Amino acid sequence: STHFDVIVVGAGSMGMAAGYQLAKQGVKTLLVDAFDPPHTNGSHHGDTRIIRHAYGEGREYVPLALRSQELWYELEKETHHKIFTKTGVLVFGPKGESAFVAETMEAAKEHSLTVDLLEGDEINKRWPGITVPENYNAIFEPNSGVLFSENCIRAYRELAEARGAKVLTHTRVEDFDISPDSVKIETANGSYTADKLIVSMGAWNSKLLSKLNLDIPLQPYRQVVGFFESDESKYSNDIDFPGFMVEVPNGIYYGFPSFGGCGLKLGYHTFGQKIDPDTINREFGVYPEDESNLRAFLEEYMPGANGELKRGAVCMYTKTLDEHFIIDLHPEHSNVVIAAGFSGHGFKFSSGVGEVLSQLALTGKTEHDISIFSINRPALKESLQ
Protein backbone atom coordinates (compact mmCIF):
# COMPACT_ATOMS: atom_id res chain seq x y z
CA SER A 1 0.00 0.00 0.00
CA THR A 2 2.76 2.45 -0.93
CA HIS A 3 2.70 3.72 -4.52
CA PHE A 4 5.61 5.91 -5.68
CA ASP A 5 5.87 8.55 -8.40
CA VAL A 6 9.00 6.86 -9.72
CA ILE A 7 10.78 3.58 -9.02
CA VAL A 8 14.51 3.27 -9.88
CA VAL A 9 15.71 -0.35 -10.18
CA GLY A 10 19.46 -0.49 -9.62
CA ALA A 11 20.76 2.36 -7.44
CA GLY A 12 24.30 2.54 -8.70
CA SER A 13 26.17 5.16 -10.71
CA MET A 14 23.23 6.06 -12.93
CA GLY A 15 20.33 5.14 -10.64
CA MET A 16 21.49 7.03 -7.55
CA ALA A 17 22.20 10.16 -9.65
CA ALA A 18 18.68 9.94 -11.10
CA GLY A 19 17.18 9.35 -7.64
CA TYR A 20 18.97 12.48 -6.46
CA GLN A 21 17.67 14.54 -9.40
CA LEU A 22 14.12 13.24 -8.79
CA ALA A 23 14.11 13.70 -5.02
CA LYS A 24 15.40 17.26 -5.40
CA GLN A 25 12.22 18.04 -7.34
CA GLY A 26 9.85 16.68 -4.72
CA VAL A 27 9.18 13.55 -6.82
CA LYS A 28 8.29 10.62 -4.49
CA THR A 29 10.99 8.11 -5.37
CA LEU A 30 11.83 4.51 -4.44
CA LEU A 31 15.32 3.20 -5.31
CA VAL A 32 15.79 -0.59 -5.17
CA ASP A 33 19.24 -2.25 -5.15
CA ALA A 34 20.46 -5.85 -4.90
CA PHE A 35 23.13 -4.67 -2.47
CA ASP A 36 23.84 -1.50 -0.46
CA PRO A 37 25.41 1.26 -2.66
CA PRO A 38 28.12 2.13 -2.89
CA HIS A 39 29.36 -1.47 -2.91
CA THR A 40 32.06 -3.64 -4.52
CA ASN A 41 29.82 -5.98 -6.56
CA GLY A 42 28.88 -3.67 -9.44
CA SER A 43 30.81 -1.31 -11.71
CA HIS A 44 31.58 1.69 -9.45
CA HIS A 45 34.16 0.72 -6.87
CA GLY A 46 37.94 0.88 -7.02
CA ASP A 47 37.76 4.36 -5.47
CA THR A 48 38.59 6.55 -8.47
CA ARG A 49 37.29 7.30 -11.94
CA ILE A 50 38.69 9.47 -14.68
CA ILE A 51 36.60 12.26 -16.18
CA ARG A 52 37.76 13.67 -19.54
CA HIS A 53 36.11 16.39 -21.65
CA ALA A 54 37.96 16.12 -25.01
CA TYR A 55 36.52 12.69 -25.82
CA GLY A 56 38.48 10.11 -27.81
CA GLU A 57 35.47 7.76 -27.98
CA GLY A 58 33.75 10.53 -29.90
CA ARG A 59 33.49 14.31 -29.96
CA GLU A 60 29.66 14.01 -29.67
CA TYR A 61 30.07 13.16 -25.94
CA VAL A 62 31.67 16.55 -25.13
CA PRO A 63 28.41 18.37 -24.26
CA LEU A 64 27.40 15.69 -21.70
CA ALA A 65 30.94 15.60 -20.26
CA LEU A 66 31.02 19.39 -19.76
CA ARG A 67 27.58 19.27 -18.16
CA SER A 68 28.58 16.37 -15.91
CA GLN A 69 31.70 18.27 -14.89
CA GLU A 70 29.60 21.29 -13.82
CA LEU A 71 27.34 18.85 -11.89
CA TRP A 72 30.30 17.26 -10.06
CA TYR A 73 31.45 20.74 -8.97
CA GLU A 74 27.92 21.33 -7.68
CA LEU A 75 28.02 18.04 -5.81
CA GLU A 76 31.36 18.91 -4.20
CA LYS A 77 29.70 22.00 -2.69
CA GLU A 78 26.68 20.10 -1.35
CA THR A 79 28.40 17.29 0.59
CA HIS A 80 31.26 16.75 3.06
CA HIS A 81 32.47 13.79 0.95
CA LYS A 82 35.36 14.49 -1.44
CA ILE A 83 34.12 14.42 -5.03
CA PHE A 84 36.73 15.70 -7.52
CA THR A 85 40.45 16.41 -7.79
CA LYS A 86 41.70 18.31 -10.84
CA THR A 87 44.67 16.10 -11.78
CA GLY A 88 44.39 16.91 -15.48
CA VAL A 89 44.33 13.93 -17.87
CA LEU A 90 47.11 12.93 -20.24
CA VAL A 91 46.28 11.04 -23.47
CA PHE A 92 49.18 9.74 -25.60
CA GLY A 93 49.97 7.19 -28.29
CA PRO A 94 52.24 6.45 -31.28
CA LYS A 95 52.06 9.38 -33.70
CA GLY A 96 49.56 8.72 -36.48
CA GLU A 97 48.67 5.35 -35.03
CA SER A 98 45.85 6.00 -32.59
CA ALA A 99 42.28 6.78 -33.59
CA PHE A 100 41.73 7.46 -29.89
CA VAL A 101 44.41 10.15 -29.63
CA ALA A 102 43.33 11.63 -33.01
CA GLU A 103 39.67 11.94 -32.03
CA THR A 104 40.65 13.42 -28.65
CA MET A 105 42.62 16.05 -30.54
CA GLU A 106 39.69 16.74 -32.90
CA ALA A 107 37.16 16.83 -30.11
CA ALA A 108 39.28 19.47 -28.36
CA LYS A 109 39.48 21.66 -31.46
CA GLU A 110 35.80 21.28 -32.32
CA HIS A 111 34.73 22.37 -28.84
CA SER A 112 37.54 24.84 -28.18
CA LEU A 113 38.72 22.94 -25.15
CA THR A 114 41.86 24.04 -23.34
CA VAL A 115 44.63 21.52 -23.99
CA ASP A 116 48.41 21.24 -24.40
CA LEU A 117 49.90 19.35 -27.35
CA LEU A 118 53.33 17.78 -26.88
CA GLU A 119 55.43 14.90 -28.14
CA GLY A 120 58.42 12.70 -27.63
CA ASP A 121 60.91 13.77 -25.02
CA GLU A 122 58.67 16.75 -24.14
CA ILE A 123 56.30 14.27 -22.50
CA ASN A 124 59.08 12.62 -20.48
CA LYS A 125 60.52 16.05 -19.57
CA ARG A 126 57.24 17.53 -18.36
CA TRP A 127 56.39 14.47 -16.25
CA PRO A 128 59.42 12.72 -14.69
CA GLY A 129 58.32 9.09 -14.33
CA ILE A 130 56.87 8.70 -17.84
CA THR A 131 59.07 7.16 -20.51
CA VAL A 132 57.49 7.03 -23.97
CA PRO A 133 59.28 6.52 -27.32
CA GLU A 134 60.17 9.65 -29.29
CA ASN A 135 57.58 8.83 -31.94
CA TYR A 136 54.75 9.29 -29.42
CA ASN A 137 52.58 12.40 -29.22
CA ALA A 138 50.13 13.54 -26.63
CA ILE A 139 47.27 15.84 -25.73
CA PHE A 140 47.01 16.91 -22.06
CA GLU A 141 43.75 18.33 -20.64
CA PRO A 142 44.57 20.41 -17.51
CA ASN A 143 41.01 20.95 -16.36
CA SER A 144 39.88 17.29 -16.45
CA GLY A 145 40.50 15.03 -13.52
CA VAL A 146 39.61 12.34 -11.08
CA LEU A 147 36.26 11.58 -9.44
CA PHE A 148 35.92 9.61 -6.21
CA SER A 149 33.15 7.35 -7.47
CA GLU A 150 32.08 5.66 -4.22
CA ASN A 151 31.92 9.07 -2.51
CA CYS A 152 29.78 10.35 -5.41
CA ILE A 153 27.20 7.61 -5.01
CA ARG A 154 27.25 7.89 -1.24
CA ALA A 155 26.72 11.68 -1.46
CA TYR A 156 23.90 11.39 -3.99
CA ARG A 157 22.26 8.80 -1.78
CA GLU A 158 22.54 10.78 1.46
CA LEU A 159 21.19 13.89 -0.25
CA ALA A 160 18.33 12.07 -1.97
CA GLU A 161 17.31 10.34 1.26
CA ALA A 162 17.43 13.62 3.18
CA ARG A 163 14.90 14.86 0.62
CA GLY A 164 12.59 11.88 1.07
CA ALA A 165 13.73 9.29 -1.46
CA LYS A 166 13.50 5.76 -0.01
CA VAL A 167 16.24 3.23 -0.71
CA LEU A 168 15.42 -0.46 -0.39
CA THR A 169 18.70 -2.38 -0.10
CA HIS A 170 19.75 -6.01 -0.51
CA THR A 171 16.65 -6.50 -2.62
CA ARG A 172 16.97 -8.07 -6.02
CA VAL A 173 14.24 -7.16 -8.46
CA GLU A 174 13.31 -10.33 -10.33
CA ASP A 175 10.48 -9.34 -12.65
CA PHE A 176 8.48 -6.40 -13.99
CA ASP A 177 4.83 -5.78 -14.85
CA ILE A 178 4.30 -2.80 -17.12
CA SER A 179 0.92 -1.36 -18.05
CA PRO A 180 -0.02 1.69 -20.13
CA ASP A 181 -0.44 3.76 -16.96
CA SER A 182 1.73 2.16 -14.28
CA VAL A 183 4.77 0.06 -13.58
CA LYS A 184 5.25 -2.68 -10.98
CA ILE A 185 8.34 -4.60 -9.78
CA GLU A 186 8.64 -7.96 -7.99
CA THR A 187 11.19 -8.85 -5.30
CA ALA A 188 11.54 -11.44 -2.54
CA ASN A 189 10.84 -8.57 -0.13
CA GLY A 190 7.59 -7.49 -1.78
CA SER A 191 6.20 -5.75 -4.86
CA TYR A 192 5.86 -1.98 -5.53
CA THR A 193 3.98 0.22 -8.04
CA ALA A 194 4.67 3.62 -9.58
CA ASP A 195 3.82 5.81 -12.56
CA LYS A 196 7.35 5.59 -14.00
CA LEU A 197 10.25 3.17 -14.02
CA ILE A 198 13.96 3.72 -14.52
CA VAL A 199 16.03 0.60 -15.20
CA SER A 200 19.75 0.92 -14.48
CA MET A 201 21.02 -2.48 -13.32
CA GLY A 202 24.55 -2.25 -14.76
CA ALA A 203 26.01 -5.68 -15.60
CA TRP A 204 22.68 -7.31 -14.73
CA ASN A 205 20.92 -5.48 -17.56
CA SER A 206 22.40 -8.26 -19.74
CA LYS A 207 20.36 -10.88 -17.83
CA LEU A 208 17.17 -9.04 -16.90
CA LEU A 209 16.16 -6.75 -19.74
CA SER A 210 14.66 -9.86 -21.32
CA LYS A 211 12.02 -9.52 -18.56
CA LEU A 212 10.96 -6.30 -20.33
CA ASN A 213 10.72 -8.06 -23.69
CA LEU A 214 14.05 -6.56 -24.77
CA ASP A 215 16.76 -8.48 -26.65
CA ILE A 216 19.87 -6.34 -26.89
CA PRO A 217 23.42 -7.59 -27.05
CA LEU A 218 25.10 -6.66 -23.77
CA GLN A 219 28.31 -8.43 -22.73
CA PRO A 220 29.68 -8.11 -19.19
CA TYR A 221 33.48 -8.16 -18.83
CA ARG A 222 35.73 -8.78 -15.84
CA GLN A 223 38.03 -5.77 -15.54
CA VAL A 224 40.69 -5.50 -12.84
CA VAL A 225 42.89 -2.66 -11.57
CA GLY A 226 45.93 -2.63 -9.35
CA PHE A 227 47.57 -0.08 -7.03
CA PHE A 228 51.40 -0.25 -7.00
CA GLU A 229 54.01 1.17 -4.61
CA SER A 230 55.56 4.06 -6.52
CA ASP A 231 58.25 6.72 -6.47
CA GLU A 232 56.11 9.36 -4.72
CA SER A 233 58.46 12.14 -5.86
CA LYS A 234 57.21 11.40 -9.39
CA TYR A 235 53.76 9.77 -9.37
CA SER A 236 51.99 11.63 -6.60
CA ASN A 237 49.01 13.87 -7.29
CA ASP A 238 50.95 16.30 -5.10
CA ILE A 239 53.70 16.73 -7.72
CA ASP A 240 51.05 16.94 -10.49
CA PHE A 241 51.36 13.49 -12.04
CA PRO A 242 48.20 13.29 -14.19
CA GLY A 243 45.42 10.77 -14.57
CA PHE A 244 45.74 9.18 -18.02
CA MET A 245 44.21 7.03 -20.75
CA VAL A 246 46.67 5.99 -23.42
CA GLU A 247 46.93 3.78 -26.50
CA VAL A 248 49.93 1.47 -27.11
CA PRO A 249 50.33 -1.25 -29.77
CA ASN A 250 48.63 -3.85 -27.59
CA GLY A 251 45.69 -1.76 -26.40
CA ILE A 252 44.43 1.07 -24.21
CA TYR A 253 45.43 1.55 -20.57
CA TYR A 254 44.25 4.10 -17.97
CA GLY A 255 45.64 5.18 -14.62
CA PHE A 256 45.70 7.57 -11.74
CA PRO A 257 48.42 9.31 -9.78
CA SER A 258 49.09 8.16 -6.22
CA PHE A 259 46.76 9.97 -3.79
CA GLY A 260 48.10 10.27 -0.25
CA GLY A 261 50.59 7.47 -0.92
CA CYS A 262 48.00 4.91 -2.09
CA GLY A 263 50.17 4.09 -5.11
CA LEU A 264 49.65 4.70 -8.83
CA LYS A 265 46.54 2.80 -9.96
CA LEU A 266 46.34 1.14 -13.39
CA GLY A 267 43.92 -0.74 -15.58
CA TYR A 268 44.04 -2.49 -18.97
CA HIS A 269 40.97 -1.21 -20.83
CA THR A 270 40.67 -3.18 -24.07
CA PHE A 271 40.94 -6.68 -22.61
CA GLY A 272 38.88 -8.44 -19.94
CA GLN A 273 37.26 -11.86 -19.43
CA LYS A 274 33.74 -12.40 -20.68
CA ILE A 275 31.70 -13.30 -17.60
CA ASP A 276 28.27 -13.49 -16.00
CA PRO A 277 27.67 -10.97 -13.16
CA ASP A 278 26.44 -13.71 -10.83
CA THR A 279 29.39 -16.08 -11.28
CA ILE A 280 32.30 -13.69 -11.89
CA ASN A 281 35.35 -14.36 -9.70
CA ARG A 282 35.92 -11.09 -7.88
CA GLU A 283 39.29 -11.96 -6.38
CA PHE A 284 42.18 -10.03 -7.93
CA GLY A 285 45.12 -12.18 -9.00
CA VAL A 286 43.36 -15.48 -9.69
CA TYR A 287 44.22 -15.14 -13.38
CA PRO A 288 47.95 -14.61 -14.01
CA GLU A 289 47.03 -11.84 -16.50
CA ASP A 290 45.46 -9.73 -13.76
CA GLU A 291 48.84 -8.55 -12.55
CA SER A 292 51.10 -9.27 -15.54
CA ASN A 293 49.20 -7.16 -18.09
CA LEU A 294 49.57 -4.19 -15.74
CA ARG A 295 53.30 -4.63 -15.03
CA ALA A 296 53.89 -5.21 -18.75
CA PHE A 297 52.72 -1.62 -19.26
CA LEU A 298 54.41 -0.11 -16.19
CA GLU A 299 57.93 -1.48 -16.77
CA GLU A 300 57.84 0.02 -20.25
CA TYR A 301 56.08 3.41 -19.70
CA MET A 302 56.06 4.29 -15.94
CA PRO A 303 59.00 2.27 -14.60
CA GLY A 304 59.19 4.07 -11.25
CA ALA A 305 55.60 3.00 -10.52
CA ASN A 306 56.17 -0.77 -10.75
CA GLY A 307 56.68 -1.77 -7.13
CA GLU A 308 54.82 -4.04 -4.77
CA LEU A 309 51.16 -4.60 -5.49
CA LYS A 310 49.36 -2.75 -2.69
CA ARG A 311 45.79 -3.48 -3.63
CA GLY A 312 43.67 -4.94 -6.40
CA ALA A 313 39.96 -4.69 -7.29
CA VAL A 314 37.74 -6.58 -9.74
CA CYS A 315 34.98 -4.75 -11.46
CA MET A 316 32.71 -5.00 -14.54
CA TYR A 317 32.13 -3.29 -17.92
CA THR A 318 28.91 -3.96 -19.82
CA LYS A 319 29.54 -3.45 -23.53
CA THR A 320 27.17 -2.81 -26.41
CA LEU A 321 28.26 -3.73 -29.95
CA ASP A 322 29.29 -0.14 -30.79
CA GLU A 323 30.48 0.68 -27.24
CA HIS A 324 28.14 3.68 -27.02
CA PHE A 325 25.57 3.87 -24.19
CA ILE A 326 21.84 3.18 -24.22
CA ILE A 327 19.73 5.92 -22.69
CA ASP A 328 16.21 6.06 -23.99
CA LEU A 329 12.57 5.19 -23.35
CA HIS A 330 11.58 1.55 -23.71
CA PRO A 331 10.38 1.32 -27.36
CA GLU A 332 7.05 -0.20 -26.23
CA HIS A 333 6.57 1.66 -22.94
CA SER A 334 6.93 5.42 -22.68
CA ASN A 335 6.79 5.00 -18.90
CA VAL A 336 9.97 2.92 -18.67
CA VAL A 337 13.41 4.46 -19.01
CA ILE A 338 16.47 2.36 -19.82
CA ALA A 339 20.08 3.20 -19.01
CA ALA A 340 22.53 0.43 -19.99
CA GLY A 341 25.71 -0.65 -21.78
CA PHE A 342 28.03 2.00 -20.50
CA SER A 343 30.85 -0.04 -21.99
CA GLY A 344 33.48 0.77 -19.42
CA HIS A 345 33.49 4.58 -19.75
CA GLY A 346 30.23 5.85 -18.29
CA PHE A 347 30.88 6.87 -14.69
CA LYS A 348 32.20 10.32 -15.59
CA PHE A 349 28.79 11.02 -17.18
CA SER A 350 26.70 9.62 -14.33
CA SER A 351 25.78 13.06 -12.98
CA GLY A 352 24.63 14.23 -16.39
CA VAL A 353 22.89 10.89 -17.02
CA GLY A 354 20.93 11.11 -13.76
CA GLU A 355 19.62 14.45 -14.98
CA VAL A 356 18.73 12.94 -18.34
CA LEU A 357 16.98 9.97 -16.74
CA SER A 358 15.01 12.28 -14.44
CA GLN A 359 13.83 14.33 -17.41
CA LEU A 360 12.87 11.20 -19.41
CA ALA A 361 10.90 9.72 -16.50
CA LEU A 362 9.03 12.95 -15.76
CA THR A 363 8.45 14.31 -19.26
CA GLY A 364 9.19 11.56 -21.75
CA LYS A 365 11.89 13.85 -23.21
CA THR A 366 15.18 15.48 -22.33
CA GLU A 367 16.82 18.80 -23.17
CA HIS A 368 20.06 16.92 -23.97
CA ASP A 369 20.79 15.47 -27.43
CA ILE A 370 20.87 11.75 -26.70
CA SER A 371 20.29 10.50 -30.23
CA ILE A 372 23.68 8.73 -30.25
CA PHE A 373 22.39 6.59 -27.35
CA SER A 374 19.13 5.61 -29.05
CA ILE A 375 17.88 2.14 -28.16
CA ASN A 376 16.67 1.83 -31.79
CA ARG A 377 20.01 2.49 -33.50
CA PRO A 378 21.09 -0.19 -36.05
CA ALA A 379 24.60 -0.66 -34.67
CA LEU A 380 23.07 -1.87 -31.43
CA LYS A 381 21.26 -4.83 -33.08
CA GLU A 382 18.26 -4.44 -30.76
CA SER A 383 15.06 -6.49 -30.79
CA LEU A 384 12.00 -7.66 -28.82
CA GLN A 385 10.78 -11.25 -28.16
Ligand X SMILES: *Cc1cc2c(cc1C)nc1c(=O)[nH]c(=O)nc-1n2C[C@H](O)[C@H](O)[C@H](O)COP(=O)(O)OP(=O)(O)OC[C@H]1O[C@@H](n2cnc3c(N)ncnc32)[C@H](O)[C@@H]1O
- Pick 48 or 335: Cβ nearer ligand X: 48
Residues 52, 157, 171, 315: which is the catalytic one?
Answer: 315
The verdict on 53 binding ligand X (CB under 6 A) reads no
β-bridge mates for residue 160, sequence order: none
Give dist(CA 156, CA 327) in Å, integer. 20
The verdict on 342 binding Cl ion (CB under 5 A) reads yes
Residues 163, 166, 207, 269: which is the catalytic one?
Answer: 269
Q: What's the first-to-final CA gap in the chain, in angstroms?
A: 32
Contact residue for ligand X among 24, 86, 172, 377 (CB under 6 A)? 172
Angle of helix 350-363 relative to helix 149-162, nearest 10 degrees, comes to: 40
The verdict on 43 binding ligand X (CB under 6 A) reads yes
Q: Which stretch binds ligand X (CB under 6 A): 9-17, 117-125, 190-198, 212-220?
A: 9-17
Residues 53, 157, 348, 366: which is the catalytic one?
Answer: 348
Give dist(CA 178, CA 167) in Å, integer. 21
Give dist(CA 23, CA 317) in Å, integer. 28
Residues 196, 265, 324, 345: which is the catalytic one?
Answer: 265
Give dist(CA 155, CA 65) in Å, integer. 20
The verdict on 33 binding ligand X (CB under 6 A) reads yes
Tell whether omega for the bond before 38 is within 30 degrees of 0, i.e. cis: yes
The verdict on 34 binding ligand X (CB under 6 A) reads yes
Q: Tell me the closest approach of the beta carbon of residue 49 to Cl ion, in angstroms.
A: 11
CB 50 within 8 A of CB 256: yes
Total residues interacting with ligand X, rule: CB under 6 A = 39
The verdict on 9 binding ligand X (CB under 6 A) reads yes
Residues 292-311 that bind ligand X (CB under 6 A): none
| Per-residue contact flags (x/-) with ligand X for residues 210 to 239, judged by CB under 6 A | -------------x-x--------------
Does the annotation count 368 as an active-site position? no
| Per-residue contact flags (x/-) with ligand X for residues 174 to 213, judged by CB under 6 A | --------------------------xxx-x---x-----
Estimate to the nearest angstrom the gap between the alpha carbon of 203 and the chain centroid.
12
Residues 310-349 that bind ligand X (CB under 6 A): 315-317, 342, 344-348
Q: Which of 329, 374, 319, 333 is nearest to 202 (CA)?
A: 319
Give how far Cα 255 sits from Cα of 25, 158, 246, Å.
37, 29, 9
Give dist(CA 184, CA 190) in Å, integer. 11
Total residues interacting with Cl ion, rule: CB under 5 A = 5
Give dist(CA 53, CA 61) in Å, integer. 8
Which residues does the annotation mark as catalytic? 45, 48-49, 265, 269, 315, 348
Q: Which residues bind Cl ion (CB under 5 A)?
A: 43, 317-318, 342, 344
